[PDB]
Design a binder for these strands. Structure first.
Ligand SMILES: [K+]
Ligand SMILES: [K+]
Ligand SMILES: [K+]
Ligand SMILES: [K+]
Ligand SMILES: [K+]
Ligand SMILES: [K+]
Ligand SMILES: [K+]
Ligand SMILES: [K+]
Ligand SMILES: [K+]
Ligand SMILES: [K+]
Ligand SMILES: [K+]
Ligand SMILES: [K+]
Ligand SMILES: [Mg+2]
Ligand SMILES: [Mg+2]
Ligand SMILES: [Mg+2]
Ligand SMILES: [Mg+2]
Ligand SMILES: [Mg+2]
Ligand SMILES: [Mg+2]
Ligand SMILES: [Mg+2]
Ligand SMILES: [Mg+2]
Ligand SMILES: [Mg+2]
Ligand SMILES: [Mg+2]
Ligand SMILES: [Mg+2]
Ligand SMILES: [Mg+2]
Lengths: 84, 150, 100, 206, 212
RNA sequence: AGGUUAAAACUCAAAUGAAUUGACGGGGGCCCGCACAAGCGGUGGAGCAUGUGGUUUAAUUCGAUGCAACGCGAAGAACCUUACCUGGUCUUGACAUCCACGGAAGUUUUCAGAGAUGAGAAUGUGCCUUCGGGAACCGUGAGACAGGUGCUGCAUGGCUGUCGUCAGCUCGUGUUGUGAAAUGUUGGGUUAAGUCCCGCAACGAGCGCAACCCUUAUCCUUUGUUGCCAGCGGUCCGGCCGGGAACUCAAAGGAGACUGCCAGUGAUAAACUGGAGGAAGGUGGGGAUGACGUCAAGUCAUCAUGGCCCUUACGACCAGGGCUACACACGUGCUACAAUGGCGCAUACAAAGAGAAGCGACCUCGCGAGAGCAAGCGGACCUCAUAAAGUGCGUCGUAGUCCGGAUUGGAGUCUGCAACUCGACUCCAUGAAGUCGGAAUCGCUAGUAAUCGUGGAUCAGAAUGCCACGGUGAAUACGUUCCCGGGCCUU
């Protein structure tokens, strides 16, 4: 994965959004296209809607989710089974 | 081929025993162009054969070959709705070629740990006419005898 | 290629030249072990702000005559089809059919 | 089947390169692009000049362009006015000091490019394709070509089905490398579509 | 495949469905209702010719006396799918049709409108004419421009045979060398789209064209 | 049994005879080709890589489909690419020309927005200059127009596959035939070859064949550093140094192979067979080179182009997604199934190639991938860069293993704005199928197959593919009865 020397990657717009939400209080789910952004400890307790390409999927950040990209919790491809 | 312009290729004699016959055998035993590996196996096998035989390696090799060598073979010929196996005399060079090939095949099929051991045991069995390679020669002769009419 | 596709490439080359110095500096700050973690963090965020087209990676080599995105040769700056045509006409110096 | 480009195969044997300059990989592509632009400009500007071949050389930092034309005067202009105009534009395109040399082409009937350009012009003028082809063959043989071949392909005569017709006189030995074969092609843009002309001219071995 | 029906046919289907339903609303005698149910059912079947399962389902809902207007709308929407839209000519082709009128301009026509358009007509204020394009029995596109009256009066429209706000439309014959010309026309709806929706018979429009 | 005499309605625009050019035959003759035979190694079974079909999907972009589609266009899809989908946007416009009008261009920054972009601020304000000005380039407004990887490869050009590097295909004139046509081009020998000779109502000619071209095998001449070190001198033992131009090698120019010589055979022929010499022998080896034509074969998505269609959208811009889906079928590969091997340690012998937004040594650090530092080298100089198989020694002992390395968990490295979907690589752990593959099927005649490594293009990164380079190095060809294809003649 990303080098440790480089540190964790997050999109600046998301970082600002998270900080604004934390200060404000409980907020309506944040809408982001930044699937690549890593989930941070500050995000815990905030619902972030991540784009799957066709729609934003609401994701409630938890402690376990920290250290993972937001994209992992939103599925891009839809499969309901072959000949199902 | 149709042109029949094929010519013989020179074969260097085996270094140790100075035999072109043994050099051919190495080439038959050789796999993936690894002549040195093949040469080591042949020389090891011959030594083991010589100790048990109490004869020179080349002499012992020749005795094994003599038993395995086939005088006559059958070539298939299609006549009408059936195919006829036709007995044909084997040329002296081919006799040697078939014998060596059969011994190598026989050695490989044996369950001894090393190829050198497998080869030596097969060569010894060939000398006493108990080898699987000798059985092939017997089978080839038997088939030819049956088809003698053709 | 389409005229737009050729236009896109020109923009990407232009932006890369504009921010070449800035990008190099920022990347150096992140690379340096001695640099403070705060300094690195600020640099990372700044590099994101810079236009994506500024990145040299975004630029894709195209045939200069046709703008073809595949079969490019760096030596001639042309795709295989145009290289062949020029080679036959003798427009490419020193280039001939090779047999060995 | 398909055939090798006659000039391409003979390049470095009996055929010279149009561009003869040395560059490293860094500058090789840039020179090719500049050469293309210069040739493109000159061809458009000197379309009626009966230009056959443009030789681009790059001595030192300068570019020397030699233009082979059947009609040298019209390229030169009056008191070298036209050539000077060309030089200034070429220098701008090249980005380096430019020299323009004009070379007359004698026996324009024996030049493949000039023949091809003539036929295509006639086809656009709606001259019968057969007549244009035959005359070109006849003209070259009179001028002393050892052989000539002319091929015209496309919707000939505005026919819905495209066909290829070829006329050859004398020897045209394409396989012989020492044989000097002048080859060039021209496209005729008509209301029916594109008609392609190919001309081979044999000028003797070696 | 889904049945294909003309726009005028769909308008008839809508009319008969509304008529059929109104019987349920008014008529108190089941016997009389039943007679009309059968008549309408046949008429809808006749237009479709072949009825698919979707049409059959709709027909079943139609047959029920408990049919509702909301249900009718849904049934109509399904029937709209069966309808085939009017084919707009290429802009070049349109100009070829209106050779006399150089640089003729066409307004954007709604896809639904096209689907329900037996004919397409547009009015230009500067022209003071109504430009009508339609496909005849031969199915050749026919384009005609005739003067439309600025005054609007309430009367039965010739094209649709329905009382509506109508403006007199006159078509001029080709001018002779003398300069004599004959204009023949009748009152028609000012809005072509409204008239199209009103029209249930393609023949009525054809008759109007014959009069011109 | 039937015979004989013998209609019509109706229907078709031909039916028919002879001969001609092809094609075809489970007709004939004669040759030939990895065609068979003779061999060697595979594929079809396993796992994995990759393409395709199908299915699925918002979309899984488009094209290629017997041989001659299927590691194909694509010499390299995270974004870009991208042509597709979803959402957010723009309409003389992302890209041109023209005109009017206002601003040098630009340079640095702020906020909002996923971004596109919009609202701002600040700083420049040049260049030419008949102090009329231009044109530099930003704008803004028209409208002619732009734009389209949109459709038709069955409208086309160009280019390509294919039969097939097969030996064919033709024309002029003459002659024959009422004519389509024939002759030449057939015949006797011969060749790899319509190659050649001889004969001959043909006489000639052209395109093919061959040769001319590149490379490899031998030698000579010139040149001698960055390459070489025979004879010397000296040594730090290293061509290392002073030297030598001998040798290797570099790369320019030459020589050499011609059936030339010799013997036999053959029609006092062409030619063939053997032999000598020679580095090389009869096409010495490899390559390039592909006739007239065939398949309305492939490509309107390289490009160009007739026609058609869209033009506030079928054009253009941005973010995210997809092209990587997965009940399944197939093509092509990679790695295995071990002991002719695995592993450990020690130790030999290449060629070819690439490099400045590059190759990067040494040294230091990390288990390692790497990191830091930093030479040299635009290169016979420096770097990539380690050849591997091999060989010696030790160990394993026929086990699903000390075989195999899929899969997965954890921890990292590097490139890149960014590796979630969806990179490569490393470390630790994990340790699947597989024990040699049904019917069937493929390649190969020698430095070949097999096997072993090495490099390059594309490319930020991303090869089991592709292209190229050396190492080691076989088996077998009796032969033409048979199978298949091809050429010529005849029917
Ligand atoms: K009759
Ligand atoms: K297999
Ligand atoms: K074509
Ligand atoms: K003739
Ligand atoms: K006759
Ligand atoms: K087109
Ligand atoms: K996948
Ligand atoms: K593979
Ligand atoms: K396979
Ligand atoms: K990735
Ligand atoms: K790379
Ligand atoms: K025949
Ligand atoms: Mg790229
Ligand atoms: Mg009777
Ligand atoms: Mg398999
Ligand atoms: Mg197609
Ligand atoms: Mg993409
Ligand atoms: Mg075609
Ligand atoms: Mg010939
Ligand atoms: Mg040749
Ligand atoms: Mg086709
Ligand atoms: Mg995108
Ligand atoms: Mg794909
Ligand atoms: Mg022949």
């Amino acid at each position: 994965p990303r080098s440790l020397k480089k540190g964790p990657f997050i999109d600046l717009h998301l970082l600002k959004k998270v900080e604004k939400a934390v200060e404000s209080g409980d907020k309506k789910p944040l809408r982001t296209w930044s699937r690549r952004s890593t989930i941070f400890p500050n995000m815990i307790g905030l619902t972030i809607a991540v784009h799957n390409g066709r729609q934003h999927v609401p994701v409630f950040v938890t402690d376990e989710m920290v250290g993972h990209k937001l994209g992992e919790f939103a599925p891009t491809r839809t499969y309901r089974g072959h000949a199902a | 081929p149709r042109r029949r312009v094929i010519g013989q290729r020179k074969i260097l004699p085996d270094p140790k025993f100075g035999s072109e016959l043994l050099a051919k055998f190495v080439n038959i035993l050789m796999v993936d162009g690894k002549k040195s590996t093949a040469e080591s196996i042949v020389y090891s096998a011959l030594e083991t054969l010589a100790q048990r035989s109490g004869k020179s390696e080349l002499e012992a090799f020749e005795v094994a070959l003599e038993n395995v060598r086939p005088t006559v073979e059958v070539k298939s010929r299609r006549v009408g709705g059936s195919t006829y196996q036709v007995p044909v005399e084997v040329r002296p060079v081919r006799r040697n070629a078939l014998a060596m090939r059969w011994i190598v095949e026989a050695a490989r099929k044996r369950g001894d740990k090393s190829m050198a051991l497998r080869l030596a045991n097969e060569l010894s069995d060939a000398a006493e006419n108990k080898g699987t390679a000798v059985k092939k020669r017997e089978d080839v002769h038997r088939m030819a005898e049956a088809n003698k009419a053709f | 290629a389409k005229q737009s596709m050729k236009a896109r490439e020109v923009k990407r080359v232009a932006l890369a030249d504009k921010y070449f110095a800035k990008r190099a500096e920022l990347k150096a700050i992140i690379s340096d072990v001695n640099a403070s973690d705060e300094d690195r963090w600020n640099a990372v965020l700044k590099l994101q702000t810079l236009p994506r087209d500024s990145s040299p990676s975004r630029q894709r080599n195209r045939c200069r005559q046709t703008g073809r995105p595949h079969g490019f040769l760096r030596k001639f700056g042309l795709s295989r089809i145009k290289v062949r045509e020029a080679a036959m006409r003798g427009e490419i110096p020193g280039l001939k059919k090779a047999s060995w | 089947g398909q055939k090798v480009h006659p000039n391409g195969i003979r390049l470095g044997i009996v055929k010279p390169w149009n561009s003869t300059w040395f560059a490293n990989t860094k500058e090789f592509a840039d020179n090719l692009d500049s050469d293309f632009k210069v040739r493109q400009y000159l061809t458009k500007e000197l379309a009626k000049a009966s230009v056959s071949r443009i030789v681009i050389e790059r001595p030192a930092k300068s570019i020397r362009v030699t233009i082979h034309t059947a009609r040298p005067g019209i390229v030169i202009g009056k008191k070298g006015e036209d050539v000077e105009k060309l030089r200034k534009v070429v220098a701008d395109i090249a980005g380096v000091p430019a020299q323009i040399n004009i070379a007359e082409v004698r026996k324009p009937e024996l030049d493949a490019k000039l023949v091809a350009d003539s036929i295509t012009s006639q086809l656009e003028r709606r001259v019968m394709f057969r007549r244009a082809m035959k005359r070109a063959v006849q003209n070259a043989m009179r001028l002393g070509a050892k052989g000539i071949k002319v091929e015209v392909s496309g919707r000939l005569g505005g026919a819905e089905i495209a066909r290829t017709e070829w006329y050859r006189e004398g020897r045209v030995p394409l396989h012989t490398l020492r044989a000097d074969i002048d080859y060039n092609t021209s496209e005729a843009h008509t209301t029916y579509g594109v008609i392609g002309v190919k001309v081979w001219i044999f000028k003797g071995e070696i | 495949m889904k049945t294909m029906i003309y726009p005028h046919q769909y308008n008839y289907i809508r009319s008969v469905i509304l008529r059929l339903k109104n019987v349920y609303k008014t008529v108190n005698d089941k016997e009389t209702v039943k007679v009309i149910q059968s008549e309408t059912y046949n008429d809808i079947n006749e237009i479709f010719g072949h009825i698919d399962d979707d049409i059959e389902e709709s027909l079943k809902v139609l047959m029920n006396i408990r049919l509702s207007n909301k249900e009718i709308e849904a049934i109509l929407n399904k029937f709209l799918e069966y309808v085939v839209p009017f084919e707009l000519p290429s802009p070049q082709k349109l100009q070829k049709v209106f050779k006399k009128v150089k640089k003729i301009k066409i307004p954007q026509f709604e896809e639904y409108d096209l689907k329900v358009s037996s004919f397409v007509g547009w009015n230009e204020l500067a022209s003071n004419r109504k430009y009508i394009i339609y496909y005849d029995e031969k199915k050749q596109l026919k384009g005609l421009y005739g003067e439309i009256s600025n005054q609007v009066v309430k009367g039965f429209c010739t094209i649709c045979n329905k009382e509506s706000n109508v403006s007199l439309f006159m078509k001029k014959s080709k001018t002779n060398s003398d300069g004599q010309y004959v204009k023949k026309g009748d009152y028609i709806c000012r809005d072509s789209i409204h008239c199209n929706k009103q029209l249930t018979d393609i023949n009525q429009f054809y008759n109007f064209i014959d009069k011109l």
